[PDB]
Amino acid sequence: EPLTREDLIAYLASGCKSKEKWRIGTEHEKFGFEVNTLRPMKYDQIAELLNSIAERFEWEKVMEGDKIIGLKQGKQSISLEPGGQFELSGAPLETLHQTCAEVNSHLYQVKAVAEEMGIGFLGMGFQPKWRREDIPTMPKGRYDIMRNYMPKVGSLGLDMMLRTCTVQVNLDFSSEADMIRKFRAGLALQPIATALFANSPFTEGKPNGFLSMRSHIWTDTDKDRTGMLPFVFDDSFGFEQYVDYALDVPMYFAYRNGKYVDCTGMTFRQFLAGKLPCLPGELPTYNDWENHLTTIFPEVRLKRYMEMRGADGGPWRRLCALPAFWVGLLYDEDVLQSVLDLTADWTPAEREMLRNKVPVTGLKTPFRDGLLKHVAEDVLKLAKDGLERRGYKEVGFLNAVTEVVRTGVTPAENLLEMYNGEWGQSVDPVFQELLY
Amino acid sequence: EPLTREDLIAYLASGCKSKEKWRIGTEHEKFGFEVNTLRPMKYDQIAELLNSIAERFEWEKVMEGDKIIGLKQGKQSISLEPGGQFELSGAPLETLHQTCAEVNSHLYQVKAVAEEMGIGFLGMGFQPKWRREDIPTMPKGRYDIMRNYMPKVGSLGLDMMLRTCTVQVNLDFSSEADMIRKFRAGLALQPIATALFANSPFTEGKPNGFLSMRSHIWTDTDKDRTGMLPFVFDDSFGFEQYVDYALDVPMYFAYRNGKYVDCTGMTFRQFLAGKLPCLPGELPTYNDWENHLTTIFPEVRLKRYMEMRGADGGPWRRLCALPAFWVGLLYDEDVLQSVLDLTADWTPAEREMLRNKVPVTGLKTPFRDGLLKHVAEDVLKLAKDGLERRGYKEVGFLNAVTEVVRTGVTPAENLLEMYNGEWGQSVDPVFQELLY
Ligand SMILES: N[C@@H](CCC(=O)O)C(=O)O
Ligand SMILES: N[C@@H](CCC(=O)O)C(=O)O
Ligand SMILES: [Mg+2]
Ligand SMILES: [Mg+2]
Numbered sequence: 001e002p003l004t005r006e007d008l009i010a011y012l013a014s015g016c017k018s019k020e021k022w023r024i025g026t027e028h029e030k031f032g033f034e035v036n037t038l039r040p041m042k043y044d045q046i047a048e049l050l051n052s053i054a055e056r057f058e059w060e061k062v063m064e065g066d067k068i069i070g071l072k073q074g075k076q077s078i079s080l081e082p083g084g085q086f087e088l089s090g091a092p093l094e095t096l097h098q099t100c101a102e103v104n105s106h107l108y109q110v111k112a113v114a115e116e117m118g119i120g121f122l123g124m125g126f127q128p129k130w131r132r133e134d135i136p137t138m139p140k141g142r143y144d145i146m147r148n149y150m151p152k153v154g155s156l157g158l159d160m161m162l163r164t165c166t167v168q169v170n171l172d173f174s175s176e177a178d179m180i181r182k183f184r185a186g187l188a189l190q191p192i193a194t195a196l197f198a199n200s201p202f203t204e205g206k207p208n209g210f211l212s213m214r215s216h217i218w219t220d221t222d223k224d225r226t227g228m229l230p231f232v233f234d235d236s237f238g239f240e241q242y243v244d245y246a247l248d249v250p251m252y253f254a255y256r257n258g259k260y261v262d263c264t265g266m267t268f269r270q271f272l273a274g275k276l277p278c279l280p281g282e283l284p285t286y287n288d289w290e291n292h293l294t295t296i297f298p299e300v301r302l303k304r305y306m307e308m309r310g311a312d313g314g315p316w317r318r319l320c321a322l323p324a325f326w327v328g329l330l331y332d333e334d335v336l337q338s339v340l341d342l343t344a345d346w347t348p349a350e351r352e353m354l355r356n357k358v359p360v361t362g363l364k365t366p367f368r369d370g371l372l373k374h375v376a377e378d379v380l381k382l383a384k385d386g387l388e389r390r391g392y393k394e395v396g397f398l399n400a401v402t403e404v405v406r407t408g409v410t411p412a413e414n415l416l417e418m419y420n421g422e423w424g425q426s427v428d429p430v431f432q433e434l435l436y
Numbered sequence: 437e438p439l440t441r442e443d444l445i446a447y448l449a450s451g452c453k454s455k456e457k458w459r460i461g462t463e464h465e466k467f468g469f470e471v472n473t474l475r476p477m478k479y480d481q482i483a484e485l486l487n488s489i490a491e492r493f494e495w496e497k498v499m500e501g502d503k504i505i506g507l508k509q510g511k512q513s514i515s516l517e518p519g520g521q522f523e524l525s526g527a528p529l530e531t532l533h534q535t536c537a538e539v540n541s542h543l544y545q546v547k548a549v550a551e552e553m554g555i556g557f558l559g560m561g562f563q564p565k566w567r568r569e570d571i572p573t574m575p576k577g578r579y580d581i582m583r584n585y586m587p588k589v590g591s592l593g594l595d596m597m598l599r600t601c602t603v604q605v606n607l608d609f610s611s612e613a614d615m616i617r618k619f620r621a622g623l624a625l626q627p628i629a630t631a632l633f634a635n636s637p638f639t640e641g642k643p644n645g646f647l648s649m650r651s652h653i654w655t656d657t658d659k660d661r662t663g664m665l666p667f668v669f670d671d672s673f674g675f676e677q678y679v680d681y682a683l684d685v686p687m688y689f690a691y692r693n694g695k696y697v698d699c700t701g702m703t704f705r706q707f708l709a710g711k712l713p714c715l716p717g718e719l720p721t722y723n724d725w726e727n728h729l730t731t732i733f734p735e736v737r738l739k740r741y742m743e744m745r746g747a748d749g750g751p752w753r754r755l756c757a758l759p760a761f762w763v764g765l766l767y768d769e770d771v772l773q774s775v776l777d778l779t780a781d782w783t784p785a786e787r788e789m790l791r792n793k794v795p796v797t798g799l800k801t802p803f804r805d806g807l808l809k810h811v812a813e814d815v816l817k818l819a820k821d822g823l824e825r826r827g828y829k830e831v832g833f834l835n836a837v838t839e840v841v842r843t844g845v846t847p848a849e850n851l852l853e854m855y856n857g858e859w860g861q862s863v864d865p866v867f868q869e870l871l872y
Contacts, residue, residue: 104541
């Protein structure tokens, strides 16, 4: 009995969980580099790193052919982005104390192997030193397919793939109503998160004119699968409408017979009808749908959980702060409403503007009769309220962004200040400044 | 059916484990201090620390009355030495990668709570700044009993209790023959470990004339229950002879009716006969025997496992190095024999001398036609051989002592060099230098 559109809707809806079952999934990506040369870490070094972590700390190996590309341990996964960015996808955890302990565990295991390899890790949103052609490409079929497709849909998507790092958080919803509310809160506030975590002002050894070049890159990666999703704020919005959106987003690939088939320029509607030209007659599974859902990259993404996709990679205290920010805003029901009331009369154009201007000016971005800084003050207060109300003593995790909001000065701006003062207008010291 | 001497022997013998079942138990102690004042951390702060770790990181509370004095999580325990020294007693682990991960986990959890309390931790062998009367006394009955007894048996035992920190390792034996061999290897080499980890040259803000004042303190704590145990090297030595030794060591207390009874100046032989004056008619259990065994403090201690008791507390890389040192020497059968051959013609006087002089001169201690440094070169080579042969890639854990052996310069000596140069003959910067 083949899958239908209605099944695809139900798949998203099956993510619905009672408040007591809500968890926090935190993912972050890091640039590996040779300590002596600063050169980006190569696949051969990455494979040694993965193999050694697996043996020392009891992880299961994830393979593509004879190539190790990741690790699994319970509900944690370690994986590789296209330019070797080294990712932890954490477990679904109950508290942010557990989240930060999980981040520390990972950083410890990584460094315990990498140190004798002469390898360091950098927490930034965009690779500050090296050109696109300097970046190692990982031996993964799905990335080869994507690398070929990116140039067809934008100028900066290859930089997304090879030269950016994010920290994100994955969160749960209890119902469609709850999902709609979190999606709208998450989208309206995403540019505030982008500003607070902005950490990518350098390209190839110089300032690039941005505070988050990473966030900027996502505005010219591919228009079919990015952005602020204004339709989410339409009264019609719901699981059904997100499915229709996703069905309109062209496919990258389908996994069949052990490998990723290039299905670029094709649609999941074709797949549903058994009429994918890359796979004539094959019918999709839930895994196929899940796979397709994971090729969509808006500022907030929906699957069986919701992803806040807004934020630059950063040092460990910000890795623990990102999930804390969103937990406080979205996991307290009153605070969630407060965000909705705060952002209720924001127009589609205003949201779009904030998303587009924040990468340049961060919290100094003008907004109405003031700066984005003033809105960030209100939102941070709310985030702290929600952590306090959770009763787990998690509010100290927002310490790492309290000073940013207070001063209106982003992390990227602090880096630029060092670059111009103490660093003698070189980015090389950032590899010590932001070393894990 | 009451316990007999033969049962007490069998209790030690029940520790015997097949090589595949051997594990590594690592314990270390740390001084807590207020970051601003450097004052030693008080019991009220300690209780908050313990309570917060328990709640955040899921530890079970260990109580004495309404007073929290420790935590339990599986086979790990956190506990308090008499002056508040903050101890982790780790799980029995298979590899040193696991050991060091365990140390990191603990340091992370401690710091994650202590930072907002304004509390730091110092890894040293002896409290470098404060007087004996400055040290908080923990509200534990068994320590109150001990504090009263110490002055009756030495001048420095109160300093042992209040002002020292160790890192130790607990290891397994397969049989009585194996136990005898490890005990003799462990005793003969203990002063080499003491020298390599020597990290206590300051008393009350000045140099005290030693490299390990901590190790020195153990030579005037109590002669009945300390030292190099020359009888271990007698041909008669075995489980039986250790039991006779322990039976000769006077008791501190017995736990009965929820509390520690003062049984100082009494013996376990009295207990065995039901003739303890502190507990007339009570007969001992295995727990009572275990309790008594844990009031014996030689350079190597025997219970159901063997403890290397030689080494000063220190920074995290030395916490992982201590257990690695002994694992390489004692857990490879060939290396174990090599240690025995190396130390075969060492006399009781020579061993005693090394134990007594190492606290003053470390690796510069004369020994025969050279310095202790030259013996340490041989022993470190052997330790590395044993780690290599284990096949777990654990040899990098001896990196933290390779330079000490090479140069013949102890950690204590490096501290003294800083004290006299950069620190302006104050010990206060050690609280930053050796901050966890
Ligand atoms: N590395 C991308 C995110 C890639 C992904 O996980 O989809 C970024 O910096 O935003
Ligand atoms: N704190 C003591 C060891 C105490 C014990 O655990 O018996 C030392 O520095 O050696
Ligand atoms: Mg990723
Ligand atoms: Mg102890």
